[PDB]
Design a binder for this molecule. Structure first.
Ligand SMILES: *[C@@H]1O[C@H](CO)[C@@H](O[C@@H]2O[C@H](CO)[C@@H](O[C@@H]3O[C@H](CO)[C@@H](O)[C@H](O)[C@@H]3O)[C@H](O)[C@H]2NC(C)=O)[C@H](O)[C@H]1NC(C)=O
Ligand SMILES: *[C@@H]1O[C@H](CO)[C@@H](O[C@@H]2O[C@H](CO)[C@@H](O[C@@H]3O[C@H](CO)[C@@H](O)[C@H](O)[C@@H]3O)[C@H](O)[C@H]2NC(C)=O)[C@H](O)[C@H]1NC(C)=O
Ligand SMILES: *[C@@H]1O[C@H](CO)[C@@H](O[C@@H]2O[C@H](CO)[C@@H](O[C@@H]3O[C@H](CO)[C@@H](O)[C@H](O)[C@@H]3O)[C@H](O)[C@H]2NC(C)=O)[C@H](O)[C@H]1NC(C)=O
Ligand SMILES: *[C@@H]1O[C@H](CO)[C@@H](O[C@@H]2O[C@H](CO)[C@@H](O)[C@H](O)[C@H]2NC(C)=O)[C@H](O)[C@H]1NC(C)=O
Ligand SMILES: *[C@@H]1O[C@H](CO)[C@@H](O[C@@H]2O[C@H](CO)[C@@H](O)[C@H](O)[C@H]2NC(C)=O)[C@H](O)[C@H]1NC(C)=O
Ligand SMILES: *[C@@H]1O[C@H](CO)[C@@H](O[C@@H]2O[C@H](CO)[C@@H](O)[C@H](O)[C@H]2NC(C)=O)[C@H](O)[C@H]1NC(C)=O
Ligand SMILES: *[C@@H]1O[C@H](CO)[C@@H](O)[C@H](O)[C@H]1NC(C)=O
Ligand SMILES: *[C@@H]1O[C@H](CO)[C@@H](O)[C@H](O)[C@H]1NC(C)=O
Ligand SMILES: *[C@@H]1O[C@H](CO)[C@@H](O)[C@H](O)[C@H]1NC(C)=O
Ligand SMILES: *[C@@H]1O[C@H](CO)[C@@H](O)[C@H](O)[C@H]1NC(C)=O
Ligand SMILES: *[C@@H]1O[C@H](CO)[C@@H](O)[C@H](O)[C@H]1NC(C)=O
Ligand SMILES: *[C@@H]1O[C@H](CO)[C@@H](O)[C@H](O)[C@H]1NC(C)=O
Lengths: 87, 308, 87, 87, 308, 308
């Protein structure tokens, strides 16, 4: 009973933590071109592509690590209860 | 406890571990419809922002309007004098950031020159027409004299002025329209000055005409003075536009309008913002979550499922 | 006595580690404009804003993780000592 | 015997995981310049330098964390075996 | 267990901890040789891409060729009319992204003007020569009449056109080569138009000549029409180039060629891509790992080495 | 143990956990004063770098000076001929990166033209004056002949040359100052050439004058040759500047100077660099820590505080 509510507190804190807004934008760079303009097109597309790739990376390890911590806690309490049952 | 059906999730330890429950934080899709609460949505069905500013005859309904997010349908098109917008994106984003169409008229003095010129390529009804916010200046009788107009700014805000330079097709057209063999128009403020000279030449015949117009804009600060000098080929403004600061943007879309109340608008419709991540699109407006490239970010919400 | 000096070694190594200089700049992009120039202003401001945001993010998880490790060690030794006291 | 094969599974999964390709580029921004062009040179060099620095940072914590997890597991099983030997 | 010789690695806990084994994921160096499998490698030994496009006499062998990664040796040099490439990087990257040299001739009509002009600075053999893809237009007898060549696009792909504007050294040279005292050349499509006027003046004497040529390019879409107007100092194309979409790039290198099958090519040679990181170079081609600034990224592959 | 007063810190587990002790790594503020050790600080109280380079009469004290970090007070202002710096930031950062004012004179030959022109807008004392590093060339008697001056570089370093092009107000002013109805000035090296033509017109009357000057700069490498050609409206240099490579920058500030020894300088004063992060400013100089947006980064330095 204690483990269930404890893990619930864990994931619910994790949830209401990670769902935060840290992004605020009104108007950005042009993501879409109709013709070929020159070097400025390269600058624009490259910076925005690097931005989206880096954000995807950030997200990737965010979920990776949080899931890892959830594993560590759940399997830790799992072996603990297995020990106390196999005294 | 244990359940006969677990959920497989990605980890760093092992690529797919099975737990008892998980969640699907990523928003997967949109409803398809954009809807206008609490935002003020104005539908530019067949005319974009610039055509609304110039005053095209087929969109004279959109006048003195405000908005929170202007939309641009792919079916937009122009029905007036052919033109070109030098550095179009800058002025588009500038006017889009304001969000208003408060056009305040101004009394101008045009001596010796004939105003209100029109062409059959911009028929506002049964007869020839022109733009509503612009005035075509022409010669009167036997001459086109030099013009030096001045307008001050005694207010406490900024003013937007639009003007145009006419590029004729032939030298005979220039001489018959302006006695001066060559044209020149200078806009000037106490800190910003520009000069434009027309270019006589042939252009791709669009709507049955080769002559062109080039539009330019100017910003006047409080206490600044705007001076216009001309000797031919000038399209003068009829007033100015008041500048504001607010949360106004633009988004090209083709989705229909609904009556939902939602703070997140996307070109593919609306989505709820009760989630931290979404994969519908990167281009969002208002309170919208992080954009990613992964639609299957699963979050383990239960213990490891070890069935009996 | 051993736990106190051990934890001291921990945080002091962590400190003299994270305080490293990895940034070296002499002259950078213009962060401040007096008038409106055009698209180049967008490029400049966007790249520098993305840079500062990404650096703040990096810092965020740096402190987050290090604090997490300090927790893991301190509460681990806490339950260990509670166990050895409650034999 | 079990610990050796377990740790082998650990590092081999870690390896075949981290070696993934997530980068795909055909043509990029011009890093080299022969003369001084102006502000566009600043934009170009700054964005690419920030990119390489951020990628190096990402790599840094990648190896840092993975090595950390390997430590945690190996020293955990170390004290476990020391306990079972010193009963 | 324990071993008498461990491996020192960097950590966040302590700067150097000793474990029983580690690995060296970072690729340290290259073999020095670049090799052409499964990629199609073409060696531009002494002429770069632009000289291959213009058709320099010393690289007439490279004609109608395709490639996957063009190389540019530092020993490249030109042996023809001096020139300048306005915005050189854009056109270089554009032609480099295509990867083909399919040049399709086109029938042009040049009335009243003398074609196929050459100079001793571009001798293609024993006599005077010029570029293979360009034609020098000159006056015939007593006049250089105005030109207006039109060419449509009835196909379903894009066409590349190259042209040049001649800058003479003296006004007498201009008048003797073109009866018109001043020149002007206008290229036009239904959406893109440009106009160039020559510049009479003295330039640094290169290969014994002060006159210059400026090259420009144009892209024609399906259904578009290309119109050329001229009155003097025009170098006209002899055809067009078909545009494609593929994985084609360029890389300046000086390494020799081998026969190894490898997907990763670097300017310093080839490297295997069986590793996640490398420190040879940032500029890579094909499937190549992450670039970093650290060559000593060690990964602990064993337990902590605590010797007896 | 336990204490009655703990410290609350942010975690990922719980938002605020209480431990027995913590630290405040972030530097919170500055002392307000900038001080000049071990750096060489030069105070440009009322004249910026460019005015120090041109040689304004009110800052003739700063001559042949070196520095490590130049400061620009907001009270700076010019007291000479009105001007414009095309692409000002580039030249500002270029001269700021050098850090020296070693001006080496050079012997020039100006045939048929009158040198050392001045105006009452730049009075260096009781009489009319001009810039110290520039020379105003004018006609002599009845003509302004063409000038073709040449200067080589036999040294092993780079040279900086400054020059100016005069824009008159009226055509009569141009003709009376230079007999040529139109002007043209060409700077040339073996690889870089530029040409400027003056612009006759009216400008905002500043200090009682409408005429203008446009400044340009040129870099000469070892073995290169600088050629200047002119026919009117040229402001010639009197020498050159030697280029160096070092750690020199600029920072606009209004803080007073002190005698501290410190390696970290900020526009709001100096700060110690014994910490990994600070929140005073992002623009720093020398060894200064990481910039962040959070001023409350607490680091737990004790066990969890569980009071009795
Ligand atoms: C040089 O050649 C070009 C290309 O042929 C000529 O441009 C073409 O000029 C004709 C003039 O009749 C255009 O026809 C007109 O089209 C407009 C479309 O709005 C139509 O309203 C008129 O009634 C007429 O049909 C044609 O569109 C135009 N473009 C093309 C691709 O043909 C150009 O005039 C020639 N210049 C000369 C004569 O030197
Ligand atoms: C204005 O000043 C420039 C700068 O020197 C003069 O340019 C120079 O012109 C001479 C032409 O006699 C070039 O000399 C050439 O040398 C080669 C090699 O011996 C020779 O074969 C040619 O016949 C010629 O003599 C000299 O290289 C060139 N200087 C530069 C910078 O390249 C220019 O001539 C001057 N204007 C006048 C009045 O000539
Ligand atoms: C077109 O109208 C504009 C706005 O009225 C004119 O600009 C202003 O012109 C007057 C007369 O030239 C300038 O006054 C000047 O003051 C200076 C300084 O005392 C004096 O040296 C001049 O002789 C003259 O009295 C006024 O400053 C100027 N606007 C400014 C700079 O604020 C413009 O001149 C008119 N068109 C012409 C004549 O080019
Ligand atoms: C959100 O709106 C965009 C705007 O079109 C939708 O766009 C595209 O998605 C299709 C489906 O794979 C792709 O083929 C296109 O290339 C996308 N257009 C782009 C990237 O410009 C998108 O599908 C919408 N989101 C959802 C979830 O439907
Ligand atoms: C990969 O190719 C590059 C291309 O030259 C090699 O380049 C340089 O390395 C030397 C050795 O320190 C430096 O002095 C140069 O400054 C480098 N040139 C640059 C950075 O443009 C590089 O050495 C090759 N990689 C390896 C592992 O040899
Ligand atoms: C470091 O110097 C800067 C330079 O002015 C100080 O600047 C500003 O801080 C005030 C206080 O909130 C803000 O209102 C301004 O907008 C800031 N100016 C900017 C951001 O350009 C700053 O306060 C100084 N640091 C400290 C700790 O005082
Ligand atoms: C999958 O899980 C659901 C939810 O309890 C269950 O009803 C279903 O029988 C499961 N299916 C299988 C094949 O286990
Ligand atoms: C699994 O979690 C979701 C919320 O993430 C919840 O709605 C659902 O009831 C849970 N499953 C069970 C069997 O309780
Ligand atoms: C280093 O390790 C190798 C590998 O076992 C071993 O042969 C060698 O003797 C060791 N050297 C020292 C000095 O420990
Ligand atoms: C250490 O690891 C490498 C692979 O990373 C392996 O080839 C080598 O055999 C290992 N050392 C020993 C002593 O097994
Ligand atoms: C806060 O901590 C200080 C430091 O020991 C102590 O002197 C003070 O009494 C504490 N105050 C409270 C309200 O606990
Ligand atoms: C808390 O730590 C600081 C250093 O971070 C130290 O100066 C202080 O003495 C510590 N507090 C106590 C009660 O020892």
């Amino acid at each position: 009973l204690k483990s269930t509510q404890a893990a619930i507190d864990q994931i619910n804190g994790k949830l209401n933590r990670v769902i935060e807004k840290t992004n605020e934008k009104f108007h950005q760079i042009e993501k879409e071109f109709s013709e070929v303009e020159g070097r400025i097109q390269d600058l624009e597309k490259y910076v925005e592509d690097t931005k989206i790739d880096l954000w995807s990376y950030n997200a990737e390890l965010l979920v990776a690590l949080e899931n890892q911590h959830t594993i560590d806690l759940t399997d830790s309490e799992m072996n603990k209860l297995f020990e106390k049952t196999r005294r | 406890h244990a359940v006969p059906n677990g959920t497989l999730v990605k980890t760093i330890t092992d690529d797919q571990i099975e737990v008892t429950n998980a969640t699907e934080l990523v928003q997967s899709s949109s409803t398809g419809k954009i809807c206008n609460n609490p935002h003020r949505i104005l539908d530019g069905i067949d005319c974009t922002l610039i055509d609304a500013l110039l005053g095209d005859p087929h969109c004279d309904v959109f006048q003195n309007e405000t908005w929170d997010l202007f939309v641009e349908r792919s079916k937009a098109f122009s029905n007036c004098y052919p033109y070109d917008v030098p550095d179009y994106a800058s002025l588009r984003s500038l006017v889009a950031s304001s969000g208003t169409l408060e056009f305040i008229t101004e009394g101008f003095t045009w001596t010796g020159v004939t105003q209100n010129g029109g062409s059959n390529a911009c028929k506002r009804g049964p007869g020839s027409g022109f733009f509503s916010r612009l005035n075509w200046l022409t010669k009167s009788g036997s001459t086109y004299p030099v013009l030096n107009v001045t307008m001050p700014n005694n207010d406490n805000f900024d003013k937007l002025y639009i003007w145009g330079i006419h590029h004729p097709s032939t030298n005979q057209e220039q001489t018959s329209l302006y006695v001066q063999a060559s044209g020149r128009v200078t806009v000037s403020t106490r800190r910003s000055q520009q000069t434009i000279i027309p270019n006589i030449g042939s252009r791709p015949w669009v709507r049955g005409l080769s002559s062109r117009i080039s539009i330019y804009w100017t910003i006047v600060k409080p206490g600044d003075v705007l001076v216009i000098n001309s000797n031919g080929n000038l399209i003068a403004p009829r007033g100015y536009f008041k500048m504001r600061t607010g949360k106004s943007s633009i988004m090209r879309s083709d989705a229909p309008i609904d009556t939902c109340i939602s703070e997140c608008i996307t070109p593919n419709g609306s989505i709820p913002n009760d989630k931290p991540f979404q994969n519908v699109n990167k281009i969002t407006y208002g309170a919208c979550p992080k954009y990613v490239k992964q639609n299957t970010l699963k979050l383990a919400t239960g213990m490891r499922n070890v069935p009996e």
